[PDB]
């Protein structure tokens, strides 16, 4: 026989992840952010001044050279602040924030949409839909209503 004609490359090698070092110098002046929904990024290694996440334990904020950490993202909004004083908000659907001591952010999410493409009016009907689902006694619809309200209530308070 032929001695293993094929040799498929390990696909992980195609990506170029960081080498998170313990740090033998100073800290950078601005985080290098990289936001990714399902497969495609909306932001790739952009310099940014600050970022504010919403997590299950609570609401967090980050700057350059924040302590190394990794954690969930509550289904809600995400605030970002560039060095130019402006801001950028993104509605998200869960995810995992990956902050580094070098100063780097890799927020892998499922969905990421700007606020501009959302209307409070369409959210309004979905509120009472979620409330009716929660009040409808059924394990198949109750938790679906609790989750729908879990995602509308942050938007409900972010819009107002």
């Amino acid at each position: 026989q032929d001695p293993r004609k094929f040799f498929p490359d390990n696909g992980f090698r195609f990506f170029d992840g960081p080498e998170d070092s313990f740090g033998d110098g100073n800290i950078p002046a601005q985080i290098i952010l990289t936001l990714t929904r399902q497969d495609e990024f909306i932001l790739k290694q952009e310099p940014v001044a600050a970022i504010t996440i919403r997590t299950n334990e609570g609401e967090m904020g980050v700057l350059a050279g924040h302590e190394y950490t990794v954690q969930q993202l509550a289904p809600g909004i995400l605030e970002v602040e560039y060095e130019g004083g402006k801001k950028d908000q993104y509605v998200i659907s869960g995810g995992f924030a990956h902050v580094n001591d070098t100063g780097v952010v890799d927020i892998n999410t499922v969905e990421a949409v700007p606020l501009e493409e959302i209307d409070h009016e369409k959210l309004a009907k979905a509120l009472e839909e979620a409330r009716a689902k929660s009040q409808s006694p059924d394990e198949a619809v109750r938790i679906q209503g609790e989750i729908a309200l879990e995602i509308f209530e942050p938007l409900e308070a972010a819009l107002h």
């Binding site: 659907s93 869960g94 499922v110 369409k122 989750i147 995602i151 509308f152």
Partner: peptide, 23 residues
């Protein structure tokens, strides 16, 4: 299933355009 449910809910509320037409 939790994430996919949340995503399925978020796609409903967002306005109509090429973004929703794709997503």
């Amino acid at each position: 299933r939790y994430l996919s449910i949340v995503t399925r809910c978020i796609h409903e509320v967002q306005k109509e355009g090429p973004l929703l037409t794709k997503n």
